[PDB]
């Protein structure tokens, strides 16, 4: 199906305690493959998947070069942004950046994106044409005009539609086992008494990949949307994800309820009946 490569960058200022903490991570889909942390003794871009360890010394030298250069850029951006919002020197502040490429089912470019944030809020985003910018507020319109005149989007487009998708495809092929194959959810239901007349039915999905999933509870075929507590999908730590959905029901009526599981890894959508 569809695939993506994305790079996330965070730079956090540390008043009175030296340079900003810079952290970069790379993902293909829901799998992390590289990282850089400015506080590690390494001082290098590091592999975080087996399939990226196929890359030779040149990859690790060049990516370390580039991510260090980006580190330095966001260090300056921190100072710049502090001035733009007339903030004092007392507090810590954060610049974040994200970009990357989506390919469709065919493995040909589908979408590109490139955005910043400052202290959590949106700052500037490359618009979907890859040729204009959406400034979030005014101060970002400064950045809009400079980058427009310097032809920043153009080259961004050349990476987005070039090097980005081309290396995604190389990673997709090199990590085939990890990235083109799925883990189907392992599913079950649990029951917990709340009172003598109410009980919680919880529906579990475990060891699934990718993260995208839908868990719903029905009563007599009717969706129980309003009463379903869903937890946020969460990493298991072995490359797979977990999720549950729960509903409180009247004691003695559990057999009315079914759990429904939609996931790419399942050949067809799954119905779990509490009482078969």
């Amino acid at each position: 199906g569809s695939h993506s490569m994305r790079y996330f960058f965070t730079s956090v200022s540390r008043p009175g305690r030296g340079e900003p903490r810079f952290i970069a991570v790379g993902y293909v889909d829901d799998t992390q493959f590289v990282r850089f942390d400015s506080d590690a003794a390494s001082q290098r871009m590091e592999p975080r998947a087996p399939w990226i360890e196929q890359e030779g010394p040149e990859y690790w030298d060049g990516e370390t070069r580039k991510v260090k250069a980006h580190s330095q850029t966001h260090r300056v951006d921190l100072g710049t942004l502090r001035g733009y919002y007339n903030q004092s020197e007392a507090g810590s502040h954060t610049v974040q950046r994200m970009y990357g490429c989506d390919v469709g089912s065919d493995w040909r470019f589908l979408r590109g994106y490139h955005q910043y944030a400052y202290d959590g809020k949106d700052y500037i985003a490359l618009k979907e044409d890859l040729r204009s910018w959406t400034a979030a507020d005014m101060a970002a319109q400064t950045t809009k005009h400079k980058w427009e005149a310097a032809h920043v989007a153009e080259q961004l487009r050349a990476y987005l539609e070039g090097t980005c998708v081309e290396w995604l495809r190389r990673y997709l092929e090199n990590g085939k086992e990890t990235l083109q194959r799925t883990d189907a959810p392992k599913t079950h239901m649990t029951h917990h008494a709340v009172s003598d007349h109410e009980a919680t039915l919880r529906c579990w999905a475990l060891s699934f990949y990718p993260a995208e999933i839908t868990l719903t509870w029905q009563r007599d075929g009717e969706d129980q949307t309003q009463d379903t507590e869903l937890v946020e999908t969460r990493p298991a730590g072995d490359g797979t994800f977990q999720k549950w959905a729960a509903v409180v029901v009247p004691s003695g009526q559990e057999q009315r309820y079914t759990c429904h599981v939609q996931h790419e890894g399942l050949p067809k959508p799954l119905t779990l009946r509490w009482e078969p």
């Binding site: 790079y7 970069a24 790379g26 990516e63 580039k66 991510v67 250069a69 980006h70 850029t73 300056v76 951006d77 710049t80 942004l81 610049v95 970009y99 910043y116 700052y123 500037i124 950045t143 980058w147 310097a150 920043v152 080259q155 961004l156 990476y159 090097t163 980005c164 290396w167």
Partner: peptide, 9 residues
């Protein structure tokens, strides 16, 4: 592969 160019805010 990361994007090569620099260019601050």
């Amino acid at each position: 592969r990361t994007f090569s160019p620099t260019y601050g805010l």
